[PDB]
Write a protein that holds these residues in place. Sequence first.
Motif, PDB file in Angstrom:
ATOM      1  N   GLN A  28      -6.579  32.747 -29.291  1.00 49.44           N
ATOM      2  CA  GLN A  28      -5.601  32.795 -28.345  1.00 49.44           C
ATOM      3  C   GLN A  28      -6.460  33.033 -27.016  1.00 49.44           C
ATOM      4  O   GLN A  28      -5.780  32.064 -25.913  1.00 49.44           O
ATOM      5  CB  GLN A  28      -4.827  34.028 -28.676  1.00 49.44           C
ATOM      6  CG  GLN A  28      -4.283  34.093 -30.192  1.00 49.44           C
ATOM      7  CD  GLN A  28      -3.437  35.156 -30.590  1.00 49.44           C
ATOM      8  OE1 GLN A  28      -2.956  36.058 -29.628  1.00 49.44           O
ATOM      9  NE2 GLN A  28      -2.582  35.172 -31.441  1.00 49.44           N
ATOM     10  N   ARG A  71      -6.128  19.850  -8.765  1.00 45.49           N
ATOM     11  CA  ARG A  71      -5.607  19.889  -7.616  1.00 45.49           C
ATOM     12  C   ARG A  71      -6.578  19.420  -6.515  1.00 45.49           C
ATOM     13  O   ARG A  71      -6.212  18.872  -5.623  1.00 45.49           O
ATOM     14  CB  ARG A  71      -5.176  21.457  -7.183  1.00 45.49           C
ATOM     15  CG  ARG A  71      -4.096  21.784  -8.352  1.00 45.49           C
ATOM     16  CD  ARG A  71      -3.705  23.151  -8.020  1.00 45.49           C
ATOM     17  NE  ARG A  71      -2.889  23.655  -8.971  1.00 45.49           N
ATOM     18  CZ  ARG A  71      -2.198  24.799  -9.082  1.00 45.49           C
ATOM     19  NH1 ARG A  71      -2.754  25.951  -8.519  1.00 45.49           N
ATOM     20  NH2 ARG A  71      -1.260  25.227 -10.050  1.00 45.49           N
ATOM     21  N   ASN A  86      -6.743   7.863   0.792  1.00 42.58           N
ATOM     22  CA  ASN A  86      -5.856   6.647   1.153  1.00 42.58           C
ATOM     23  C   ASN A  86      -5.453   6.519   2.339  1.00 42.58           C
ATOM     24  O   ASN A  86      -5.273   5.257   2.728  1.00 42.58           O
ATOM     25  CB  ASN A  86      -4.650   6.802  -0.041  1.00 42.58           C
ATOM     26  CG  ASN A  86      -5.188   6.877  -1.476  1.00 42.58           C
ATOM     27  OD1 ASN A  86      -6.005   6.488  -1.873  1.00 42.58           O
ATOM     28  ND2 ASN A  86      -4.218   7.881  -2.077  1.00 42.58           N
ATOM     29  N   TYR A 143       0.800  -1.269   0.030  1.00 44.84           N
ATOM     30  CA  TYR A 143       0.054   0.035   0.333  1.00 44.84           C
ATOM     31  C   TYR A 143       0.803   1.270  -0.016  1.00 44.84           C
ATOM     32  O   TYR A 143       0.305   2.289  -0.342  1.00 44.84           O
ATOM     33  CB  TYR A 143      -0.964   0.040   1.270  1.00 44.84           C
ATOM     34  CG  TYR A 143      -2.245   0.778   1.145  1.00 44.84           C
ATOM     35  CD1 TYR A 143      -3.142   0.364   0.343  1.00 44.84           C
ATOM     36  CD2 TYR A 143      -2.165   2.185   1.558  1.00 44.84           C
ATOM     37  CE1 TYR A 143      -4.289   1.043   0.210  1.00 44.84           C
ATOM     38  CE2 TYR A 143      -3.364   3.018   1.224  1.00 44.84           C
ATOM     39  CZ  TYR A 143      -4.509   2.341   0.566  1.00 44.84           C
ATOM     40  OH  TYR A 143      -5.664   3.212   0.509  1.00 44.84           O
ATOM     41  N   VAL A 198       1.322  33.050 -28.139  1.00 45.49           N
ATOM     42  CA  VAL A 198       1.369  33.674 -29.542  1.00 45.49           C
ATOM     43  C   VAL A 198       2.658  34.324 -29.751  1.00 45.49           C
ATOM     44  O   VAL A 198       2.785  34.964 -30.812  1.00 45.49           O
ATOM     45  CB  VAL A 198       0.321  34.868 -29.928  1.00 45.49           C
ATOM     46  N   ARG A 203      -6.628  15.753  -6.664  1.00 47.75           N
ATOM     47  CA  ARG A 203      -5.480  15.195  -6.245  1.00 47.75           C
ATOM     48  C   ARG A 203      -5.597  15.176  -4.682  1.00 47.75           C
ATOM     49  O   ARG A 203      -5.318  14.107  -3.896  1.00 47.75           O
ATOM     50  CB  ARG A 203      -4.300  15.850  -6.604  1.00 47.75           C
ATOM     51  CG  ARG A 203      -2.903  15.566  -5.895  1.00 47.75           C
ATOM     52  CD  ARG A 203      -2.134  16.787  -5.989  1.00 47.75           C
ATOM     53  NE  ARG A 203      -2.040  17.363  -7.363  1.00 47.75           N
ATOM     54  CZ  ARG A 203      -1.570  18.704  -7.638  1.00 47.75           C
ATOM     55  NH1 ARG A 203      -0.852  19.080  -6.889  1.00 47.75           N
ATOM     56  NH2 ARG A 203      -1.646  19.183  -8.864  1.00 47.75           N
TER      57      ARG A 203
END
Lengths: 69, 60
Positions: free
Chosen positions: B33, B48, B58, A43, A64, B51
């Motif tokens: 652009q 983020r 976990n 783990y 650009v 994550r």
Amino acid sequence: QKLFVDKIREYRTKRQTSGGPVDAGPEYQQDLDRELFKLKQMYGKADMNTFPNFTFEDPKFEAVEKPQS
Amino acid sequence: VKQASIKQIQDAIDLEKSQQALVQKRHYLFDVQRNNIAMALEVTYRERLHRVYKEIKNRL
């Protein structure tokens, strides 16, 4: 019924132990440690409450900027 | 000869007028652009949050 009550009495005897098994086992602790090490490796290493927070910048910034701009 | 001269002048006028139109719609490049840079920047912002949530789960 007789076997059942005998086993109930022995289970209560097991419950009479202050803590842990009556037979701790010379290798029970070693096996538990090996299993814990394997689980940690599989783990991944984790701390108790470590919550890192690092944010990267913008990757591969397209612009650009060109001679013909 | 006279008719040929008339044709040449008409062609020059039409060429100038046609070239005028394409100039008007030049604004499209700047919009591309702007949109590209803005979307590209926001994409990394969302990751983020994803994550951080995964990292939190976990540990438990």
